[PDB]
Design an enzyme around this catalytic site. Sequence first.
Site, PDB file in Angstrom:
ATOM      1  N   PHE A  70       0.858  -1.180   0.000  1.00  0.00           N
ATOM      2  CA  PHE A  70       0.000   0.000   0.000  1.00  0.00           C
ATOM      3  C   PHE A  70       0.892   1.227   0.000  1.00  0.00           C
ATOM      4  CE2 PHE A  70      -2.580   3.471   1.354  1.00  0.00           C
ATOM      5  CZ  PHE A  70      -3.779   3.238   0.694  1.00  0.00           C
ATOM      6  N   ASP A 101       9.365   2.863   1.367  1.00  0.00           N
ATOM      7  CA  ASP A 101       8.194   3.570   1.840  1.00  0.00           C
ATOM      8  C   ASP A 101       8.105   3.315   3.345  1.00  0.00           C
ATOM      9  OD1 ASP A 101       5.707   4.325   2.720  1.00  0.00           O
ATOM     10  OD2 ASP A 101       4.637   3.585   0.939  1.00  0.00           O
ATOM     11  N   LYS A 104       2.936  10.552   7.889  1.00  0.00           N
ATOM     12  CA  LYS A 104       2.278  10.112   9.137  1.00  0.00           C
ATOM     13  C   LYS A 104       2.893  10.743  10.369  1.00  0.00           C
ATOM     14  CE  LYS A 104      -0.225   6.028   7.585  1.00  0.00           C
ATOM     15  NZ  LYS A 104      -1.614   6.272   7.978  1.00  0.00           N
TER      16      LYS A 104
HETATM   17  C1  PLP Z   1       2.980   2.419   3.683  1.00  0.00           C
HETATM   18  C2  PLP Z   1       2.060   3.542   3.320  1.00  0.00           C
HETATM   19  N1  PLP Z   1       2.341   4.306   2.231  1.00  0.00           N
HETATM   20  C3  PLP Z   1       1.522   5.381   1.881  1.00  0.00           C
HETATM   21  C4  PLP Z   1       0.380   5.678   2.605  1.00  0.00           C
HETATM   22  C5  PLP Z   1      -0.525   6.813   2.156  1.00  0.00           C
HETATM   23  O1  PLP Z   1      -0.311   7.907   3.034  1.00  0.00           O
HETATM   24  P1  PLP Z   1      -1.371   9.151   3.030  1.00  0.00           P
HETATM   25  O2  PLP Z   1      -2.701   8.556   3.532  1.00  0.00           O
HETATM   26  O3  PLP Z   1      -0.733  10.145   4.011  1.00  0.00           O
HETATM   27  O4  PLP Z   1      -1.593   9.650   1.650  1.00  0.00           O
HETATM   28  C6  PLP Z   1       0.083   4.915   3.743  1.00  0.00           C
HETATM   29  C7  PLP Z   1      -1.188   5.174   4.508  1.00  0.00           C
HETATM   30  O5  PLP Z   1      -2.064   4.305   4.508  1.00  0.00           O
HETATM   31  C8  PLP Z   1       0.924   3.846   4.088  1.00  0.00           C
HETATM   32  O6  PLP Z   1       0.564   2.986   5.089  1.00  0.00           O
END
Ligand code: PLP
Lengths: 393, 393
Positions: free
Chosen positions: A134, A219, A248
Amino acid sequence: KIHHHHHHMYLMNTYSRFPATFVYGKGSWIYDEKGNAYLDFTSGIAVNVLGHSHPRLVEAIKDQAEKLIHCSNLFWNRPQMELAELLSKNTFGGKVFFANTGTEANEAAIKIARKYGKKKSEKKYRILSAHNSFHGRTLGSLTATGQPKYQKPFEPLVPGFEYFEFNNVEDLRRKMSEDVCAVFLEPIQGESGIVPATKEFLEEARKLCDEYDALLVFDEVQCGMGRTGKLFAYQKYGVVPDVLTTAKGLGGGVPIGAVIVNERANVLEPGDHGTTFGGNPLACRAGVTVIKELTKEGFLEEVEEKGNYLMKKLQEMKEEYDVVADVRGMGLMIGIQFREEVSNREVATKCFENKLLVVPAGNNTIRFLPPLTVEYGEIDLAVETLKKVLQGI
Amino acid sequence: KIHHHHHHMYLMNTYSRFPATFVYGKGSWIYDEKGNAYLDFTSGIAVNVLGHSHPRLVEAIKDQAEKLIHCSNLFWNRPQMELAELLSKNTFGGKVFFANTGTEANEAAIKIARKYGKKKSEKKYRILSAHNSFHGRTLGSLTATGQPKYQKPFEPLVPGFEYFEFNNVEDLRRKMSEDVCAVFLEPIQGESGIVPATKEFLEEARKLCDEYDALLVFDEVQCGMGRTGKLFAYQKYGVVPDVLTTAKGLGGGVPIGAVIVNERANVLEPGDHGTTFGGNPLACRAGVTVIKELTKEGFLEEVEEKGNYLMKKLQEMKEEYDVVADVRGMGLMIGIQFREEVSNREVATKCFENKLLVVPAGNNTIRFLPPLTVEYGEIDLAVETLKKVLQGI
Ligand SMILES: Cc1ncc(COP(=O)(O)O)c(C=O)c1O
Ligand SMILES: Cc1ncc(COP(=O)(O)O)c(C=O)c1O
């Protein structure tokens, strides 16, 4: 008057929510409009690294808002420069780009990888990411997100993405070619149900990216900013990426995202990419405050101890409760998987009814994502509450 | 002390910046680290609708930060619900989705359009947008952005997008088909150099979207939230879209974006789209404060008067100065175009040297984007400063 039973009709139906309107929070606790207190093991989905409305964060926000909120990237501002320095010095020493969210950070990463590859060859635009990954919901990040259910309504998506099995060395290797410009990985998959990479797998991805001249992109939007017991998971694993994305917990609640690149990946030129809000003094001030707190002598070492203590209690629970199939994770990022006969969503709902907040994820899991400031006693209270729920499930 | 002379080394080189480190701002004025005051006719690129650090905005931010910053969309919060109500009631009465930025709002709109289209046909995924448009830098929005220079390094982009000439009814008609799910338009193009749509052109786009069963999407990220003298430009034109996107001034400097849909476009389901930070109480509190200020009796009427006053002064200047080829816009969104022999960037540098901040754009323009609270005397001061610059250019 302003309550979810009355004002739902003004919002698009994009979320499955617990039925609570929350109005105040401090530390690990959050309160509804009636003053009922909830033990918050969501941290707003791994965002509230210092808990709700931490006094040092609140004071920095207040101070900065009185001075300068937003000037744009037409100009330079001190919080953005200080935070870039702190991120660079506390990681692998590269350069920073500020975005506002995780998905935006990953979009910048995608664009960096494409520009890097295109310098070598017009064909070198392929990107690999993991099944069940994700990476976000905007269309670049969504193409990287290895989950058809989130993609299908919005196709056609960005061409040139292919997927491999997480933790499967040979599957990753066999999908590499000279046309790959990046490999994207969460060091610990989050939404899929808390699945740590093996060190071998990350070490392989690093070697492959070196051999095929691709960028390794970690990520760390979910597993970053202290949650594993080091500032970033890659530091626990000892595998250094070319590009790191973070969001986050970076702002402790204030929206912010960032991408950090080594010099190899420092390929963007003026006009290639940008953002109106990204890098604003208010958000960056929050990030300075957060990173200064997390890097204080002993702070992360105590996160690691708390992670070990929580893991011990949950492993004991796993042995004792036949409905608990597995517990896994690192630091204070932990998933609890239930046997198929028990719904993760029902467990989460019953936790909520007993004033404990947890976050469902895939593979029939709930996530314990407490603030990094969570107290030992709060850990115990959360485990005991979950046990009580499982006793009646 | 932190300054761009040194700290530039920690930042990716993605921007062409003016050589100022800004530390403090109030109203229409911003100050560098030496205490030099600059008249800020950028508003941080159309963001600081109430000027820098407006006392009512600052009070709201401080109060909310002390209460609750972030809980996630697992739950409901009062500012988000209140802001959705206010956006709905002050526009065409639809439902709202909160994002964090303009590009993210436009990504949501693309996804809404595709979901809408796919209800009718698997082929109905094509999106039309204008040449020279600007919709954002994330890959969905970047495909909508009608500017090959921003696209080329990152191709291949999202398939199914096609472009037509802004204000050209024949070209828009040609590009329509039953496979189109949306038409995206800025009511006034911003980055291209402040180019208002004709009313005729917008009315035609509305008719064509009705005929071909497509969503009309107005991107009011730059022209919205009071800047034209009405809350949204579409209200000046009297043409109502199916989907409206907004950001920039919505939060007065705090990052936020939104999408507003009518019932026809209300098609997203839980799990289709989401964001961690979007809809957080801090940003939504800022948005409530801003919309309440803009909707106060007489506020927008006074923005209209100020726009008329500025436009009059600039029109006199145009007549008087041969180097000024055109002045255009609406309300307090104004572009000044120079003859080809004069560089818009040189004009902006010389303004900067004389303590006036303006924003370059396409078609050899500079943009005047003052705060909507700009004083009449501040307007005069900006115009007089520009004239002095043009006298020595
Ligand atoms: C690993 C990862 N990458 C990207 C995201 C997306 O982040 P945002 O909701 O701040 O766009 C998330 C959030 O769910 C995440 O868990
Ligand atoms: C019309 C328009 N749409 C979208 C955007 C992108 O907004 P953001 O920088 O907040 O992603 C902008 C900003 O340049 C804009 O002018």
